[PDB]
Structures are given as structure tokens and as C-alpha cells.
Amino acid sequence: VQNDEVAAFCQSIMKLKTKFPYTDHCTNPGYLLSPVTVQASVKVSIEIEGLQLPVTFTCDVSSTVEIIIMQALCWVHDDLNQVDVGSYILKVCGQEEVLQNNHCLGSHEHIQNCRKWDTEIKLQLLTLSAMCQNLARTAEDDEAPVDLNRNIKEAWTATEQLQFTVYAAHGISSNWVSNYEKYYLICSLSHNGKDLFKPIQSKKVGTYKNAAYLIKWDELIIFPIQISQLPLESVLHLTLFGVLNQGPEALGKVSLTLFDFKRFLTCGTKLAYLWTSERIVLQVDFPSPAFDIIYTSPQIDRNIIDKLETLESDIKGKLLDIIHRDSSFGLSKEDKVFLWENRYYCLKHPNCLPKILASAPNWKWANLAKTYSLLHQWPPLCPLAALELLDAKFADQEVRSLAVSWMEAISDDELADLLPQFVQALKYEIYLNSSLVRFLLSRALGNIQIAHSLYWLLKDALHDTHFGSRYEHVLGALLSVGGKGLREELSKQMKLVQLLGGVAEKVRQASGSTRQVVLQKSMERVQSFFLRNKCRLPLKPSLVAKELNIKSCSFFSSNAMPLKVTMVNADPLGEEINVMFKVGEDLRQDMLALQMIKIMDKIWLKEGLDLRMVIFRCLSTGRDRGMVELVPASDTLRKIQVEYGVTGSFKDKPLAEWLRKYNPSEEEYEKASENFIYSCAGCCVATYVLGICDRHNDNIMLRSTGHMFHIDFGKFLGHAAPFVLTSDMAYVINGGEKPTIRFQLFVDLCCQAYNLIRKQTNLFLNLLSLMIPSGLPELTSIQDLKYVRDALQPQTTDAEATIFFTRLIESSLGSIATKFNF
Ligand SMILES: O=C(CSc1nc2nccnc2c(=O)n1CCc1ccccc1)Nc1nc(-c2cccc(O)c2)cs1
């Protein structure tokens, strides 16, 4: 049946492939699209063929890339009628990414970065023919097949009790036989991620006589449930325990779906695989009658429910209070029961559907008809709201598929920064083929960035003990449907990272003197690689490295010695590529913190608030290793303070003098100090809301332009000053020892941004919830989310929330807070 599920998946993906022909350029562009985030004049320089100097001109940020292309065309051509405006595109110099014509110049992320750093905006005008499209799919790609490397009784008429005999575990290890004397299983039955009944424990039995590799229970297990009472998505969990010989110690876990991908109840012997990480086979024998049991969903209920009593005796106000509540998190039982009665009065508010669904009394087969009738007349949800319908608490195929149908309204650009949570949501689909995985694969088909990011996220997801096989099939489908070009580039990137990681290991394994000469020798391997391959940068695949710059490659001195890898651009119009490669730390936590910060930045920009945040990249390439973006011309606060100490003129001047050294002009220092004010406000809000703690001087970094950012996120969602404002940071903000209206601006910015994040409390809780199953040390349960919820204070109004955050700023000032009038 599993092989049949794989085959059905493959053939469905063949269908999906037909939906994306290689001829269609917008689905198959062959190149990365320059990212856009929706949100004056700036100077752009555009290189044009046949001109020795690029044309530099002032463009409106609001103007679209299409008309900017035409403006450059107008520079070189006095009449644009003869030339074709079509078949002309703009790329970033040095980066193999194409600006999107319909979108505004200001909306492009590269433009926004250059504006913040005051970097020269450098573009190239070229035809589609000149653009590198080596990633594009071929006719060979479209034609190739997909490779990932009798009577019937309806279930509602099925009286039999769910039962099965746990037979045996086969292939147990020597050290297992050494360490434990008996074994037993805990059997749980669940739906929507919750137990339907209390778990039943097997008897404790030792290894079978004459068969040490075998544990034989041969034990029947009967649940107090009836086949007709089992939801379609019912899952049986079997956890193995060993008792030590000298508490019980968990050895592994298995899951079995109670109905297969064709809705047939599992019957007969089914084998399951427990990975010690070594494969143990577990045998579960299910009843096998002379007939097949099929699940049949209930009969459709059709109603137009509109024209009902609106007594509204304070009850409408109670309903709106529940509707306009922040999230489903913590919703009272009584509130649940009456949101469920008055669910048909909430159609006017679509994004409250999860709450309603979370307040269903049960998912018994009978009530399913009315639930589905409501779902199919429900208004479309915001994609972001619809995420919640893909978490574990909603297993129902109808709910989830219709959530994905609402989700299909999301842009690729917005989707890309959300990909990790989707990769995780795959875990709550019990079948291989599902609307969610098809949605992800189709989005990857049409967008090279989506495909690339999915690839790396699936490679991390593989290391899951329980879900590794599912992710292996998903990754195989992705690599198969991506095409030959995409695949070979991904293989080059995989080889590059593996080589870099080897170099990292060797650098830490050597000591002192040796460590500097081993780096040059280890790197010769890499340079051989570059001799035979041009390879795209895994952190930003728009950058192509032709060759390693050995002499600029070094190592940072830290607990884990990171590698400063400098490579030369394949494009002479580009800059040299600088990344850090770190091994020995789980970068997935850092990535989550960075993603949360970035999403706050997006939320702020959506309401027009620009806190000038440094948004840098981090990629977990393999287990406990990866590439991190390097921010140029920036230091930790430690370093600034110690360098200043050599002079030691004042505790309040170290940040000021540093910024003044890199910004000598009075206008320049004011510009850099304003950058500090805004970025500091953003960092303070992000620190308090994410529970970022241990913000020591090393953790804080400051850019020469004046922007403040965070680098190490070891304390994430930690519990207990919320943030710390030292005297020299107050000096930069005020511009003087005494307080100025610039500090009031700082406070205003903090409180404004804080309230903007509170408005999106549901989004943030959902994103962290969906990362729960990924297995980071500080995000294991819903209480970890309750910390963030409490930090966001949803019940309070914006006014009292401002009061609260302002008191936080005073506590952060601490001893020097005497000098301020709130
Ligand atoms: O100057 C710098 C600042 S060091 C730095 N920065 C980071 N940034 C983001 C994330 N983590 C870090 C980071 O951990 N550290 C190390 C800080 C540390 C040092 C020594 C011991 C312990 C800790 N970085 C560089 N940038 C470039 C460059 C040039 C041109 C373009 C470009 O994109 C980058 C070359 S070197």
C-alpha cells in the first residue's frame, strides 16, 4: 500500500508537471527574481550595451521597473517606437536576479537595502537573450518521468472495536540487550494532535528465548472505541520503552494511520520501522475480515444560512469581544461554547474561522456534515490567518485543503520568508500526497527562489528520526520536478558546503600556529573545486563564485572558530562575495530569530514605519553548520568600548567617537545617530517581544553607518531588565548628555512599533507554534508561546500598552533614568 501511495504521488506530480510547460517563460524563467516587499527619488546607474559609461539618472522610487527600463531606453534612443521595450530587463550588477517589471523600484529589497546603507544603486539593462537561464527546465525535463531517488463495509456501519496485537520488535542491538532487561510499548490513539483516549500500556517482556534480536509480546490491545467512532485522520502511536537492569527510557516511536491513502481501514499484518540512529522492525497485526472497511465522509448538508434573530442582548457585544480577540490562545470554555452557537453570526468576520473551528465540541462523524456545510459557504481567509488551519490541532482533510485554497492567494515573495513553517506543517499531513505538498511543489515549479529555499529546508528536515522518510520522498519529488539544470547547480552548492565544512572542522582541530597554515592547505581542495566549477552562493544563489580569494580568507577568533570565506564574483560588474561559515552550532535557532525580526520589519514597513533594521541572512546547510551573511564595517560594542578605553575620556563617548570617526561631518554624525535611534528602537521591541536575553556587548553589533543589530541568539524565548540602555547609547540618541526631543522620538518609535506588532499577535503565535515540531531547545510547548503572548499584552489598549513599554524603557535606563521626565 505504501508503494501504491508513492506511485499515486508520482503520477499526480506528473499531472502537476504538465501544468508547468518549459515553454512558458513566467513559470520557467531560468533565473532568480529579485525579491519585492510592499511598502521620494534615488539615483540609479544602468549599464547599457555599446556605452562605455553607465547612464546615471534620478528615478522616482514609486515608478515601476517597466517605465524605468523605458527611461534608460529613452536616454540612448530618442524615439522608442523603433526599439522593442519588450525583451528588455534590468538586473542587479553582480547578481543573477531580474527586477520585476510590474513592481515599484522602491518595493525591491535590493533598492531598500542600498537606500539604508547609502550604497550606490547599480543595475544593468539587457535583453532576455543575454540573461543567464542555465537553471531553466528543458523539453527533456518535461518529458522525463518522476523518480523519488471483495465486499466493502462502510466505516460508519462498522461496529467492531479498534483492536490489534502488538506482535514483536525484530533486530534489537547488542547494547540494548546489555542495558535493559524488559521492554514495553505505550499505545496512544490521537486525532488533531490530541489523544482520543488515555494510552494503553503493553506488558513488560524480555528478549524471546534463543532470539536475542527479537522482543515478542504477541499481545492483543483493545481500545474503548468502535471503528465507526474513528475520524479519518486517526493515528496510532507506539512508543517503545526499556527498563534498566543495573527509570524507563524511551527507545523510539512509531505512527500508523488507521486509514490508508484510499480510506481503507488498515487490516492484517503491518510492519513499521523504528530508527535508533539502525532499523528495528515492529509488527502490528490488525484484524483481517473477509471484507474491506472503507471510510465514507458524511452526506452533504446544503443550506444558505442571513435571516436569523439578532436579539443582541449584550450577547452581540460579547461575540465581537471574542471575534476581535487576539488569538484562539487561552480562549475560555464558556467563550468556546457560545462562539460555537453563534458561529453563523460570524460569517461577516472571516479570519475568526480558526477560533470557531477550535471551539467545535467534537469531530464526531455526525457533526461533520454541519461543520463542512459551514466551511463551504465561508468567505475566503487571509493567507496569513489560514496558516493556523495547517497546524496540528486541525487534521481534517477538508479544513486543511480549503486552508490551502485560501493560501493560494499569497505572493511568492511573501511565501518565501514563510517557507520553514510550511515545511514543518508537512508533518501534520498523514498522507504523502496532499494539497499542501502539491501547493509547495507547484510554487517551487514557478519560482526558482522558492525551489532553492525548499531544497535547503528539506535537507534539514531529513534529520528527523520520525519524519525522515516522508521528507525524503518530498525532496525527491522536488529535485525530480526541478529539472536537470537546477539539480546540477544544487549539487555544486552541496559539494561546496561539504568542502567548506571539512575545512572548518580541520581549522578547529588544529591549534595555534598550525591553525593558520592548515587553512591555506585545506582551502586548496576548494580551489580545485572552483577550477572545475562555477558555483552559486547558497546564502544568495544570485551570486556566482568563479574562484576563491585565498589571501582574504581567514578565521574569526571565537568559541567556535568561524571561517571568513572571500570569493571573487563571476561577474566583473559585481563585488566580491564575503560569507561566514560556522560549524559546531545549531543555526536553526538563529534562523528563527532572524526570521521573526524580519517579519516584524515587514509589518512595520506595511504601516509605513521604517526603523532601518539590518536584515541579514543565515542558512543551515547541514546539521549544526552553515553560512551566515557578513555585515560590512561593523563591530561589537565590546570592541568599540575597549578601543575607546585606550583613551578613556568619558564613559558616554565610546559609541559617539566611533560613529564620529566613520561619520566626521556634523550632518553625517546626525544621519548616523538618527540611524542608531531608529534601529535601536526596533531592536528594543524585538528583544522584549521575542524574549531575547543575555544581550551582552558581544551580542550587540553596530554598523559604521550607525545601525544597531543582534548576532547571537542563544537566549531565545527565555524567561527572566527587558532590554538595557547604557549611558553612551542614550548619548547617541540625545546627541548630548542632557535629554532632547530625539529621545522622545525614540520613545514614540518604540511604542508605535510595539503596538504594530501587537496587532499581528495571532500571526506571530502561529509562526512560533508551527516551528514547535522542528525541535529547538526553547520551543517545545505552547507555554513557550504563552510567554510571547504575555509579552504582547493583547487585552490592553494601545494607550496603556504605550505606558507599559515606556516604563520598560525607564527600567532599561536604570541608574541614569534619574535624568529623564517620562
Ligand atoms: O566586518 C565585519 C564584522 S564581523 C561579524 N559580522 C557579522 N555579521 C552578521 C552576522 N554575524 C557576524 C559576525 O559574527 N561577525 C564576527 C564578529 C566576531 C569577531 C570575532 C570574534 C567573535 C565575533 N564582517 C565583514 N563583512 C565583510 C563584507 C564585506 C563586503 C561585503 C559584505 O557583504 C561583507 C567582510 S568582513
Residue numbers in the entry: 3 to 41, 49 to 158, 292 to 388, 402 to 432, 450 to 477, 480 to 894, 905 to 1006
Paper lines:
Phosphatidylinositol 3-kinase type 2α (PI3KC2α) and related class II PI3K isoforms are of increasing biomedical interest because of their crucial roles in endocytic membrane dynamics, cell division and signaling, angiogenesis, and platelet morphology and function. Class II PI3Ks comprise PI3KC2α, PI3KC2β and PI3KC2γ isoforms and are unique in their ability to directly synthesize PI 3,4-bisphosphate (PI(3,4)P2) from PI 4-monophosphate (PI(4)P) in vivo. PI3KC2α contains a compact PI3K catalytic core (PI3KC2αcore) that comprises a Ras-binding domain and an N-terminal C2 domain as well as helical and kinase domains and displays a typical PI3K kinase domain fold. The ATP-binding site of the unliganded apo form of PI3KC2αcore is located in a cavity between the N- and C-lobes of the kinase domain and encompasses the (1) adenine-binding pocket, (2) affinity pocket and (3) specificity pocket.
To explore the structural basis of the inhibitory mechanism of PITCOIN1–PITCOIN3, we determined the structures of PI3KC2αcore in complex with inhibitors at maximal resolutions ranging from 2.5 to 2.9 Å. PITCOINs adopt nearly identical positions in the ATP-binding site. Their pteridinone scaffold occupies the adenine-binding pocket, while the two vicinal (R1 and R2) arms that extend outward from the pteridinone moiety display specific interactions with the N-lobe of the kinase domain and cause the inhibitors to adopt a propeller-shaped conformation. The pteridinone scaffold of PITCOIN1–PITCOIN3 forms a single hydrogen bond with the backbone of V1187 located in the kinase hinge region and embeds into hydrophobic surfaces provided by M1136 and L1186 at the top, M1257 and I1267 at the bottom, and F1172 on the inside of the adenine-binding pocket. PITCOIN2 and PITCOIN3 are distinguished from PITCOIN1 by the presence of bulky hydroxyphenyl (that is, PITCOIN2) or N-phenylmethanesulfonamide (that is, PITCOIN3) substituents on the 4′ position of the thiazole group. The space demand of these polar and bulky groups leads to additional hydrophobic interaction between P1188 within the kinase hinge and the phenyl group on the R1 arm of PITCOIN2 and PITCOIN3. As a result of these alterations, the mild off-target activity of PITCOIN1 against PI3KC2γ is lost in PITCOIN2 and PITCOIN3. Interestingly, the terminal hydroxyphenyl and N-phenylmethanesulfonamide groups cause the respective phenyl moiety to adopt different orientations upon complex formation of PITCOIN2 and PITCOIN3 with PI3KC2α. The hydroxyphenyl group of PITCOIN2 faces inward and is stabilized through interaction with the solvent, whereas the N-phenylmethanesulfonamide group of PITCOIN3 forms hydrophobic interactions with E1131. While PITCOIN1 was found to be a moderate PI3KC2γ and PI3KC2β inhibitor with IC50 values of about 1 µM or above, PITCOIN2 exhibited selectivity against PI3KC2γ but showed micromolar activity on PI3KC2β.
